[PDB]
Amino acid sequence: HKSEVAHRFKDLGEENFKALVLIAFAQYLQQCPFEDHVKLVNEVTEFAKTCVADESAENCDKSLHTLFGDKLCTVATLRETYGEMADCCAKQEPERNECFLQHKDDNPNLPRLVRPEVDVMCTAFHDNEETFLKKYLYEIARRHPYFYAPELLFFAKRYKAAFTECCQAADKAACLLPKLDELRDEGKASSAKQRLKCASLQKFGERAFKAWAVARLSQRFPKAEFAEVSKLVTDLTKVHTECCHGDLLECADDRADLAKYICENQDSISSKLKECCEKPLLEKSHCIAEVENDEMPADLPSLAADFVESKDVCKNYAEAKDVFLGMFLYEYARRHPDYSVVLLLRLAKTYETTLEKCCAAADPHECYAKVFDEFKPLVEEPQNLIKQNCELFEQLGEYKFQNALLVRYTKKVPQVSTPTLVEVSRNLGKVGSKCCKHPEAKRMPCAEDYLSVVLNQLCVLHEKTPVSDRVTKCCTESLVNRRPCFSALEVDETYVPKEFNAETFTFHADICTLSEKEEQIKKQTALVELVKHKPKATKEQLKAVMDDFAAFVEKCCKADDKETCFAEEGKKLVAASQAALG
Ligand SMILES: CCCC1C(=O)N2C(N(C)C)=Nc3ccc(C)cc3N2C1=O
Ligand SMILES: CCCC1C(=O)N2C(N(C)C)=Nc3ccc(C)cc3N2C1=O
Numbered sequence: 001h002k003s004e005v006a007h008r009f010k011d012l013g014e015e016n017f018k019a020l021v022l023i024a025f026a027q028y029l030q031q032c033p034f035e036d037h038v039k040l041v042n043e044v045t046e047f048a049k050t051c052v053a054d055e056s057a058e059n060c061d062k063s064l065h066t067l068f069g070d071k072l073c074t075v076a077t078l079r080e081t082y083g084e085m086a087d088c089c090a091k092q093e094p095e096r097n098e099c100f101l102q103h104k105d106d107n108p109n110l111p112r113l114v115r116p117e118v119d120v121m122c123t124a125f126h127d128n129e130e131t132f133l134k135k136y137l138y139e140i141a142r143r144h145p146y147f148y149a150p151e152l153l154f155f156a157k158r159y160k161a162a163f164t165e166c167c168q169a170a171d172k173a174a175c176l177l178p179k180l181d182e183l184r185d186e187g188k189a190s191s192a193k194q195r196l197k198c199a200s201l202q203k204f205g206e207r208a209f210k211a212w213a214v215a216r217l218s219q220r221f222p223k224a225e226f227a228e229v230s231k232l233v234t235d236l237t238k239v240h241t242e243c244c245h246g247d248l249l250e251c252a253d254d255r256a257d258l259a260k261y262i263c264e265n266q267d268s269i270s271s272k273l274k275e276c277c278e279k280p281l282l283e284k285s286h287c288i289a290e291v292e293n294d295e296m297p298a299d300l301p302s303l304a305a306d307f308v309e310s311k312d313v314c315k316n317y318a319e320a321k322d323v324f325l326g327m328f329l330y331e332y333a334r335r336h337p338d339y340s341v342v343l344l345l346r347l348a349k350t351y352e353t354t355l356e357k358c359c360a361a362a363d364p365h366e367c368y369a370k371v372f373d374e375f376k377p378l379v380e381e382p383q384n385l386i387k388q389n390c391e392l393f394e395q396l397g398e399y400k401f402q403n404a405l406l407v408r409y410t411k412k413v414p415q416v417s418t419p420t421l422v423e424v425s426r427n428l429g430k431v432g433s434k435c436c437k438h439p440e441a442k443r444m445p446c447a448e449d450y451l452s453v454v455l456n457q458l459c460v461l462h463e464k465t466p467v468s469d470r471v472t473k474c475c476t477e478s479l480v481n482r483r484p485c486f487s488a489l490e491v492d493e494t495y496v497p498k499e500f501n502a503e504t505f506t507f508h509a510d511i512c513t514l515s516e517k518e519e520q521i522k523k524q525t526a527l528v529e530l531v532k533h534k535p536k537a538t539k540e541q542l543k544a545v546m547d548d549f550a551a552f553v554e555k556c557c558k559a560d561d562k563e564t565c566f567a568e569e570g571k572k573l574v575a576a577s578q579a580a581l582g
């Protein structure tokens, strides 16, 4: 109505409002201490209540951006702490706001957040729950300036549930830690995806984004009309554009609008939206974004009717290429919730290439008549990888599967650093343990989603520390040829064995007191190193060596006077192994 703040306050509720204002300020004033942020929040909340009480009270008519900017420009240390940014206060809206986004550091030099001992966490939680959770929101928000504030709040609440549930438990640690580790993972995954989507829109452009969207939305809402999907793809692209620019308000209003639109037209979009559409304003978007795929229409024609057999294919195509290709994708995707999005893009691209040639050929219909046959090998490549890799994972376990990946990628890109190879391999191993659990129907989408982030993170590191032209080739390839380009990597013939280093292969009894995760990482680091030294070793030779090693440990650890055993037997092992691998 007349007062924007009061409106949001009433819509949101005091609790969420305060949470959001806190996240907002922390995302910009990433450097100010916690105590300072709490004060601003109180002041803004006070102001808010004033406007709710009397919508005509002073300033209550000012816009959110203006109000937000004015308070921001209140920090006296502004110039001394952010310098350049303070200059923004001299500008006027909307340049002031714009000037602020331009100075929001996407990655500050803040210290890593250390997880305290479970007992101190629980105690702090019980003694001052309110500030325990706000501190949490503060620390996270300031480290992820672009994380969509509301998603952040969603994470906060699960964070609180974990403490409520686990601090009462008989065995707090066994209950809390795992929930915390999972939260961190999901949080980092979610954050990495948001950045990934924004980066994509930048490099690859809008068209490619809309394409990605048509496909994903079609698998989700297979009953919706193409017209509806187009409309959505359009608004969703605007949303991400604004959300990527960093402006929280616009981002939020766009998402709110999209969600209501969807909920009002839900009976013609998807049946699986009842649940999501009842939830509170703050959770609609979140819910809808993760809503389960709907059941697909029962009486659905063969694509080849409208896209191969038809006589007016080139006519309909020439008439509006993108649109036609859009309908193709839409048709292909809603019949395949089991394909990864990028696979659907590959087919679409293939179809496009074909139409581009064939529509300028003698008899078009004869040129593009067998195009669908060109899809089969494209669809099959990713399918067999899943099958082959998931079976291997069912046999060996996550850990031994991770060891297999280690041997496999170290041989492919020996140049990469050992610690990097270890991390990426463990993560890939995780993708296997979380996706192979599902039935074929959902394996590909699962892998696609996790692999996209793992691969991008891979590219980022490497981008900073280049080591191989091949990796950079794949990393700068189309985000549709990316995974395939990495799958096509072959053993490196050139790589010359690393000079033997005795130190690298000597172990002390400390490895026994080490924690599993610690032990594994130590063993795996030796593994990569072994492979870098003897890149021609075969699975059998390696297998054999690892076995001896297995014993070696179990033998030394769990045996009177361990230190000695690791220096005596260790000498033997290392010597024998070298001869074995000549
Ligand atoms: C190095 C990562 C440490 C780290 C961590 O444990 N976090 C956490 N906790 C405490 C559950 N929750 C998060 C949720 C989302 C994001 C984006 C980040 C975190 N957060 C971290 O940054
Ligand atoms: C893969 C899920 C398809 C998908 C979907 O339904 N989305 C949606 N709505 C409300 C349509 N809003 C978004 C808001 C935030 C994020 C991060 C993602 C989406 N968006 C999607 O990407």
Ligand SMILES: CCCCCCCCCCCCCC(=O)O
Residues within 6 Å of the ligand: 207, 208, 210, 211, 214, 230, 233, 322, 323, 325, 326, 329, 345, 346, 348, 349, 352, 478, 480
């Ligand atoms: C709303 C209609 C837009 C859909 C456009 C269809 C484009 C499909 C081609 C695949 C795009 C991948 C980009 C590329 O690598 O060339």
